[PDB]
Amino acid sequence: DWVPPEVFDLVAEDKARCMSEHGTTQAQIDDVDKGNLVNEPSITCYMYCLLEAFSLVDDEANVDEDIMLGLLPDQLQERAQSVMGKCLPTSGSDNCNKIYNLAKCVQESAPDVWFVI
């Protein structure tokens, strides 16, 4: 990752709250970061919950492209713009399913740009 140690202190209160709400284990978060995505609410509602905590998504899992881009380092923004060209709009049966399809889409197309923690 390009995510610096500090960012783990930042999202700590929100990460812990998002894991309680959805029954998420740390092993599930590690599976996402090794490219092993499964359509399970405890992991995909966690992803939605974290994104929602940092205003990357609204109430129907529509992504805010400018906020999502400004979180990435400058170096990846060209490639992230192209990935976002492909993977947006979001799509799915509910918010958790939308973030699932987004994650699978972003990972398939460019592992570097996907922000789960």
Does the footprint of Cl ion cover residue 28 (CB under 5 A)? no
Report the alpha-carbon distance of residue 50 to residue 52 in Å, rounded.
5
Q: Which of 68, 96, 105, 116 binds Cl ion (CB under 5 A)?
A: 96
Q: Which of 44, 90, 95, 101 binds Cl ion (CB under 5 A)?
A: 44
CA angle (22, 26, 32) in 5-degree steps: 90
Q: Which residue, 96 or 113, is less far from Cl ion as judged by CB?
A: 96
For Cl ion, which stretch binds (CB under 5 A), given 7-15, 31-39, 61-69, 72-80? 31-39
Take residue 5 and report the two structure tokens written for it: 């140690």
Alpha helices (H) in the chain, listed in sequence order: 6-10, 12-22, 26-32, 41-53, 65-71, 77-87, 95-109
The least CB distance from residue 103 to Cl ion, in Å, is 10
- Residues within the interface to Cl ion (CB under 5 A): 39, 44, 96-97, 100
